[PDB]
């Protein structure tokens, strides 16, 4: 029953309330899933993606931590190589 893009949308908003606008969080989720479903992952395109959004963001201790939780959440996600394990991982973060 879990579908990937709205699940990620919900988790990111729970990690980082109000950090991104609705429109930008959706664009971010779409770019994340595009990288996640790419055939072969090269280097670490994920961190550069996140760094790009972080340039547009606020310096404050709250938002710094929000971005750290996002990048650790996504780093582990991009380590998961099969779908049932991914569902399990996401279902854990759905408690937040």
Numbering used by the authors: 0 to 95
What does the paper say about this structure?
Microtubule (MT) filaments, composed of α/β-tubulin dimers, are fundamental to cellular architecture, function and organismal development. They are nucleated from MT organizing centers by the evolutionarily conserved γ-tubulin ring complex (γTuRC). S. cerevisiae γTuRC is built from a helical repeat of seven ‘V’-shaped copies of the tetrameric γ-tubulin small complex (γTuSC), composed of Spc97/GCP2 (SPB component 97/γ-tubulin complex 2) and Spc98/GCP3 subunits each bound to a γ-tubulin molecule. Here we used cryo-electron tomography to determine the structure of the native γTuRC capping the minus end of a MT in the context of enriched budding yeast spindles.
S. cerevisiae Spc98 has a structured N-terminal α-helical domain (Spc98NHD), as predicted by AlphaFold2, not visible in the inactive recombinant yeast γTuSC filaments. We determined a crystal structure of the Spc98NHD at 1.9 Å resolution, revealing a compact α-helical bundle nearly identical to the AlphaFold2 prediction. Interestingly, S. cerevisiae Spc98NHD is more compact than the extended GCP3NHD/GCP6NHD folds alone and thus more similar in size and fold to half of the composite Mzt1-GCP3NHD/GCP6NHD structures. This observation could explain the absence of Mzt1 in budding yeast as Spc98NHD is more compact and its structure by itself makes up for the lack of Mzt1. The γTuRC luminal bridge density can in principle accommodate a trimer of the Spc98NHD crystal structure, in agreement with an AlphaFold2 prediction of a trimeric Spc98NHD oligomer (head-to-tail). Additionally, we observe densities connecting the N-terminal base of Spc98 and the luminal γTuRC density, consistent with our preliminary annotation of the luminal bridge as a trimer of Spc98NHD. It is likely that the other four Spc98NHD domains are not bound in the γTuRC lumen, and are averaged out due to the flexible linker between Spc98GRIP1 and Spc98NHD, similar to γTuRC in higher eukaryotes. Consistent with our model, deletion of Spc98NHD in S. cerevisiae impaired cell growth under stress and reduced γTuRC oligomerization propensity in vitro. In budding yeast, however, there is no Mzt1 homolog, nor nuclear actin, and we propose that the luminal density corresponds to an oligomer of the compact Spc98NHD helical bundle.
